[PDB]
From a paper:
PGAM5 is a mitochondrial membrane protein that functions as an atypical Ser/Thr phosphatase and is a regulator of oxidative stress response, necroptosis, and autophagy. Phosphoglycerate mutase family member 5 (PGAM5) is a mitochondrial membrane protein that belongs to the phosphoglycerate mutase (PGAM) branch of the histidine acid phosphatase superfamily, known also as two-histidine phosphatase (2H-phosphatase). Despite harboring a canonical RHGE catalytic motif, PGAM5 lacks a typical phosphotransferase and/or phosphohydrolase activity for small metabolites, and displays instead a phosphatase function specific for Ser/Thr and, potentially, histidine residues (Takeda et al., 2009, Panda et al., 2016). Overall, the catalytic domain of PGAM5 adopted a classical phosphoglycerate mutase-like fold with the canonical three-layer sandwich topology, which featured a six-stranded β sheet flanked on both sides by α helices with the first four parallel strands arranged in an alternated β/α manner.
To provide high-resolution details of the catalytic center, we also determined the high-resolution structure of ΔN90-PGAM5 in complex with phosphate. The β3-α3 loop was the region that showed the highest degree of flexibility with two major conformations observed, an opened form in the apo and off states and a closed form in the on state (root-mean-square deviation [RMSD] of ∼0.9 Å with an average Cα shift of ∼3.9 Å for residues 175–179). Binding of a phosphate ion induced a number of rearrangements in the active site resulting in two distinct on and off states, which were termed in relation to the “in” and “out” conformation of H105, respectively. In the on state, in addition to H105 all catalytic residues were observed to assume a potentially catalytically active position. This conformation was most likely induced by the closure of the β3-α3 loop which moved E177 inward, triggering an inward swing of H230. In a concerted manner, the “in” H230 likely forced an approximately 90° rotation of R152 side chain orienting perpendicular to H105 and planar to Y108 for cation-π stacking. In comparison, the stark difference of the off state of the enzyme was characterized by an “out” position of H105, rotating away from its catalytically competent position. This movement was likely a consequence of steric constraints created by R104 and R152 that retained their “vertical” conformations. Although this conformation maintained affinity for phosphate, the all-out rearrangement of the catalytic residues presumably depicted a catalytically incompetent state of the enzyme.
Author numbering:
A (entry chain B): -1 to 0, 90 to 179, 192 to 289
B (entry chain A): -1 to 0, 90 to 182, 192 to 289
The structure:
């Protein structure tokens, strides 16, 4: 169980990886989703809406692929409120930047996963639209797995990862990197 | 990842949990799939057939629930041989005497070493292998192959008929590509028991 964790209720955390995008955009402006990526986000959006859950929020960063993945999914989840955060931004001396980028991933974990809400009386269902690296960090961290193994988790574009966090901080992984709802010819990791 | 491992090509391991069944069945022969369980198995079969992979083999637990799940899945994978093994029968629950657990631990380790860790010197191309079994068996194999601690077993929750996909590189690096995938099943067909 996560240490120093008390919540009022159970929290269901859904971590969605960005869909495929033009990684060769000169400026962020240009790193939009590929046509395949747009279809992926659509499929992830239909899947999420089909769950019969009233989601509490969709948290995401300000990167072009993040905003675009979010926009598409969000149209399937009418009324669910969106929250922009730069703790989910993926960075782009070099060495000092990278340390800082890593520290931000931990802050993301701390701020959004390890921290529970006092207002929250009942079970919550929370979506986070993220880059691969923050998902796999969050998974290892919440599950108390060796952080050195985070890169052993291979997350498809648009995939859904579901963690369950009980009031006493016991955590269960119900699924990781699910793209079972996409036709196999639509699945990508880049 | 795995130590003392050198394979000639990549190995894709698909670990499939059995479909919903009659837990109340009085003998092992009575613990057959429910009608919903048979629908789940069908869905998993459809999904596996749709990946466009030539599966090398279907290795399955000899428990009735695992047999019936395999019967249904294998109809979608014509020409893939099926091999029954006692090594993949479910282990005693982690959440009941100690010699039972020693026995089960030893067997499931044997299963891991025989089916997951052992590279075939006759492999001549990338392989795709299906193992139809049980939650504790899969949890153990996943954690062992990824070097996750034994307290991780019970933190992994696998749906009935779910697909867990590991990729084993020739030098022994292991990636977890998906765990507990039932994303191909409508939510109103999804169960854990």
């Amino acid at each position: 169980s996560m240490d120093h964790y008390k919540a009022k209720a159970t929290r269901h955390i859904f971590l969605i990886r960005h869909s495929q995008y033009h990684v060769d955009g000169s400026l962020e402006k240009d790193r939009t989703l590929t046509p395949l990526g747009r279809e992926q986000a659509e499929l992830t959006g239909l899947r999420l809406a089909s769950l019969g859950l009233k989601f509490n929020k969709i948290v995401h960063s300000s990167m072009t692929r993040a905003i675009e993945t979010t926009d598409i999914i969000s149209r399937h989840l009418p009324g669910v409120c969106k929250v922009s955060t730069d703790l989910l931004r993926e960075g782009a001396p070099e060495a000092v930047q990278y340390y800082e980028d890593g520290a931000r991933i931990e802050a993301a974990f701390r701020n959004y996963i390890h921290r529970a809400d006092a207002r929250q009386e009942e079970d919550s269902y929370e979506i986070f639209i993220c880059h691969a690296n923050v998902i796999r960090y969050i998974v290892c961290r919440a599950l108390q797995f060796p952080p050195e193994g985070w890169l052993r988790l291979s997350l498809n574009n648009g995939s859904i990862t579901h963690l369950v966090i009980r009031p006493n901080g016991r955590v269960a992984l119900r699924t990781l990197g699910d793209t079972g709802f996409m036709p196999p010819d639509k699945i990508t990791r880049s």
